[PDB]
Design a binder for this molecule. Structure first.
Ligand code: PU1
Length: 209
C-alpha cells in the first residue's frame, strides 16, 4: 500500500516559501544535497569502525550525479547510511520543525535562501528546481523505501520493489520545465566546482546517453 501523510504545517509553509519566493540563485540546491550525501557517508564510515559488518551491504563510499534528459531527472545517489521508515515519516520532521522556525526568522533579519543549509533543512532547496522529489533509500536496519512529494501539503511512502540499492539514498529531482539547465554536463560541472570541490568522497558525473 502507498501510504499518504500530511506534512506538519510548518514544513508545508517552508515548502511554499521555497516554491513561491522570487530568488534567482537556485543552483545552491546541489551543494545542499551533496553535502547531505557527504554527512550520510561520514555516518556509515564512522559506524563501521566499531562494527565492520555495517559495510556488508557495500564497501564503496561515493556519490553519483546522473542526468536524464528523457525523464527530465537529475538523480543524486550516495552509498551513505540510508534512512529508515521512522526517519522518513517522523524523526526528520521533528528536527526539521525547529530548523524551519529559525530559518524563517533569519530571512527576517535579512538572510537569504542560500543559507538554508545552516538550519538543517537544506533538503527542501530541492523544490527550487524540482516539481516533484522522489527519495529512494535503504538503511541496514530496515527495508528499501520510496518517499515522494510534489509539495501541496502531502507526501507518500511505500516499500520500494525497484532495483535494490544495497545501502544508501537516491534523490530523484523531477525538474521544473524551465530548469533543465541542471541536466547539462557543463552546468553541473560548473556548480560542483564552485560549491562542492572539497567533498571527501569521489563524485562521478555520469554523462548521457
Ligand atoms: C535533515 C537532515 C539529514 C538527514 C536526512 N537526509 C537527507 C535530507 C532529507 C531531509 C528531510 O527532512 C528534513 C527529508 O524529509 C522530507 C528527507 O526526505 C527523504 C531528506 Cl532526503 N538527505 C540524506 C541522505 N542523502 N542520506 C541520508 F542517510 N540521510 C539524508
Amino acid at each position: 500500500e502507498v501510504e499518504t501523510f500530511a506534512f506538519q504545517a510548518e514544513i508545508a509553509q517552508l515548502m511554499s516559501l521555497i516554491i513561491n519566493t522570487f530568488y534567482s540563485n537556485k543552483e545552491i540546491f546541489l551543494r545542499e544535497l551533496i553535502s547531505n550525501s557527504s554527512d550520510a557517508l561520514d555516518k556509515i564510515r564512522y559506524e563501521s569502525l566499531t562494527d565492520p559488518s555495517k559495510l556488508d551491504s557495500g564497501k564503496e563510499l561515493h556519490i553519483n550525479l546522473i542526468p536524464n534528459k528523457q525523464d527530465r531527472t537529475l538523480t543524486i545517489v550516495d552509498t551513505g547510511i540510508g534512512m529508515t521508515k521512522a526517519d522518513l515519516i517522523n524523526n526528520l520532521g521533528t528536527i526539521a520543525k525547529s530548523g524551519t522556525k529559525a530559518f524563517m526568522e533569519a530571512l527576517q533579519a535579512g538572510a537569504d535562501i542560500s543559507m538554508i543549509g545552516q538550519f538543517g533543512v537544506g533538503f527542501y532547496s530541492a523544490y527550487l528546481v524540482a516539481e516533484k522529489v522522489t527519495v529512494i533509500t535503504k538503511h541496514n536496519d530496515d527495508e528499501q523505501y520510496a518517499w515522494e512529494s510534489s509539495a501541496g501539503g502531502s507526501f507518500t511512502v511505500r516499500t520500494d520493489t525497484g532495483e535494490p540499492m544495497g545501502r544508501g539514498t537516491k534523490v530523484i529531482l523531477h525538474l521544473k520545465e524551465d530548469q533543465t539547465e541542471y541536466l547539462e554536463e557543463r552546468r553541473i560541472k560548473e556548480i560542483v566546482k564552485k560549491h562542492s570541490q572539497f567533498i571527501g568522497y569521489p563524485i562521478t558525473l555520469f554523462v548521457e546517453k
